[PDB]
Homo-oligomer: 265 residues x 4
């Protein structure tokens, strides 16, 4: 009674070369959606598509090599891929830099990359979805959008902003079956984190599992779950939201942070 | 890749004689969970179990006739049903009464019914779940917990409170795989609403579908979805949260209100 | 130059023989308001009244000895002081007890004390203020109302419920010059907290400043301001809100917690 | 009796030749503070300065003609007025344009104007205030920051982003007596809004009070207070926060919207 009726639907997953974006893509094609994988580097895109052909040899994949952080990257894609039934705004970059040190241009970069990507894309895909009363748009933000991270003012700002953008969009869907919602993942075990855990805690013969554990206890004491979230975990929800089974959720920001944010919300 | 591994798990759904509670029960047994249906009236419980045997003739149902709004109702159940792997706190009552008119005792009733039920039950089931590091507890609140309804101060208060209770519980699960979360449904087409729509709007030859529509536009202008949420809709999520697929959501309050609450949250 | 315009107004400060309550009162009497000091024990009411005059000889006070935590204390104060222009619902009371150890009895008590006191008093006063088009009601909650205290979930729930009650009440003042708001003070240096410090960090022989210092380090790592809040600092805000000056604030929940809650709110 | 203690302090009120900005300034000069009036056009700065003295002859002002919406205006004001004890980030600017009609260009503009003005100015001033242990920075957002305006999503995003920026900044003041907070005024009677009313409800010949009256009915049905907010009413709050009196408020977002946002917040 709980089918994800998303076979035959084309989903775009921006910056899905690795991490969450990769997890989300895999899960979605696993439910027979025609996933359009986007990444800046042509190598990274192909290499990802291979990891996937390997898992679902009967699958419809499409490499969308482009830079969605650039104005010209985006316009190419609305040209080359006019129809998109499910849009996941996963593209988002970051770099830790104490606040007084963030150069000015960096604020302009993180905004163009983490927001305009979403604005630019939806300016066409949502319009299109609205005319046909059908589809999803989901933003991948982070628990930072509510609890700003101490060494990423700007990133934290971009996340917080996404929420706004997300809600304003959700309200353009009045009457239809199109939902625009945002999810907020907590600390996930991406691949940069993966190896970050190797070098961290030296001098203490530690296993990488035991390592996650002390790292959480150490730098992320408010986590109830007490471990990184595996991409798959985020992917489950994203998929759920992608399905027409989630038609009652529109204009929401759902926290998927294993407890991080101490708030009754 | 998205299985709800909840076959063999016993789920308790308080006040599941009708409405959401009924929708949630059905969906859950539909995924092979051993559902324990609770209702105050012995008739209402049986009558519900029949509608269900009818749908899943190969199903494990258990009538739990009891009043979970009473102290003695609850203690009977922890006695008679010691093991519960999934606990849905659906029981909740209400009655519209202008604020200055709510008698005092009514505030005491709505609190005992809409909160103590949850407190009392979890005081044992959560404790138990924590010792075995496994299980879910979900609270069915309402978008009222954030946007209080004008003619239900007390009900609105009870909802708002649930959020707190929910978050405090989520924090007892530190380290385990037990999640305690709350969802907030919007205006749903229960059965009291169902017929409320019949008498409403007389004098205007209207179909009941067209009726929902003007009623939303009329008394619920902030809804993006523009129609009642069908119980099934809530049930989808509840089930999702019931599954171990949702292990990254702990201590959250997810809005499932089709847009009602105008908030970037 | 910004006139507080408090002279001639009658303010009832519940549970104000000590802590934040006592400070609140002091401030209003300083500002020319007519204040009614209320506590359960006659001893404390006069003692508090003595202090206040000892500082402001031209003070306008009125002792109100009643347990506003009872249906009857409330009935009495209402029959007796019919006209109140300003109602500060300060009366509140916590106790740390692990969730599974909280007796069922205890929930109703905090309920009646931290919530019904509010309800009862406002059922009568707010009604009056509205027919009169002018007035103020302010609820003193705590940062717990948003970030629950792991040591006392019941107290936490009542604080969260104040937020709902407050907002509904506010919505009733529609079209008038009456306002209803809530403030969430963080942890403050009240004799209660003072005692608890001497009490804790045992056998280290520490002067309250040293004592306060590491309690914030160990137990309130999240505070920006990094110290206990002096009672006076909360009064400042309440006095501002009591004034006509705050006319635009209505149905808000103002955080005054020295940065405790890590939320862009 | 509650001393605002503003004499001797230097306050920079960005974009304060009009509306809320102009009111804010007035209030601080009334309170003895040294105020720097800032606008893009030299004409307006002196005109505003004339008004203020016309009311307070002993006024301490200083004209700051610069476009704080530019990298260079900011650089100039910083090089020139190095020591500022109080920074009110009031400079902001909206425009109604349907989401799909908003030019890509426009996003960067509002970004640079409503956000970088904040960032740039604080990169310099807050840094200083912290090394000095004392200071205040306040951001003037709007109710949009929580409840987005359907007419201008870009302006909405920048208001929501202020909330993040504000909270991060706050967290940097850890251990000092510097505070960073944000206020969300609702709709106010600013000449801008005044013009728009004359402009709208055409051919009905309505005096501004009648005009204001139904605009709130039709367009702000959600307001409790039911009228436009007079600029003075926002200044009151900002002045309070500017004062040392508000020492306990840190990293908060205070709603001052006459009840617009229906949220227990």
């Amino acid at each position: 009674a709980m089918h994800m009726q998303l076979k035959g639907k084309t989903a775009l997953v921006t910056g899905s070369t690795a991490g969450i974006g990769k997890a989300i893509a895999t899960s979605l094609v696993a439910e027979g959606a025609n996933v359009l994988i986007n990444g800046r580097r042509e190598e990274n895109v192909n290499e990802t598509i291979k990891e996937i052909r390997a898992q679902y040899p009967d699958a419809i994949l499409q490499p969308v090599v482009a830079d969605l952080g650039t104005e010209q990257g985006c316009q190419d894609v609305i040209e080359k891929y006019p129809k998109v039934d499910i849009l996941i705004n996963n593209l988002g970059i970051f770099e830790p830099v104490e606040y007084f040190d963030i150069p000015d241009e960096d604020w302009f970069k993180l905004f163009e990359v983490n927001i305009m990507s979403g604005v630019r894309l939806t300016r066409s895909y949502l319009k299109k979805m609205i005319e046909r009363k059908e589809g999803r748009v989901i933003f991948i933000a982070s628990e930072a959008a509510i609890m700003p991270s101490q060494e990423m003012a700007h990133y934290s700002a971009t996340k917080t902003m996404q929420l706004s953008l997300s809600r304003s969009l959700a309200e353009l869907t009045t009457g239809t079956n199109v939902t625009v919602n945002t999810i907020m993942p907590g600390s996930t075990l991406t691949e940069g984190v993966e190896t970050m855990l190797n070098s961290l805690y030296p001098n203490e013969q530690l296993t990488i599992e035991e390592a996650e554990k002390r790292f959480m206890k150490e730098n992320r004491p408010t986590s109830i779950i007490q471990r990184l979230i595996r991409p798959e975990e985020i992917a489950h929800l994203v998929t759920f939201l992608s399905s027409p089974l989630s038609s009652a959720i529109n204009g929401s920001a759902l926290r998927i942070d294993g407890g991080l944010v101490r708030s009754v919300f």
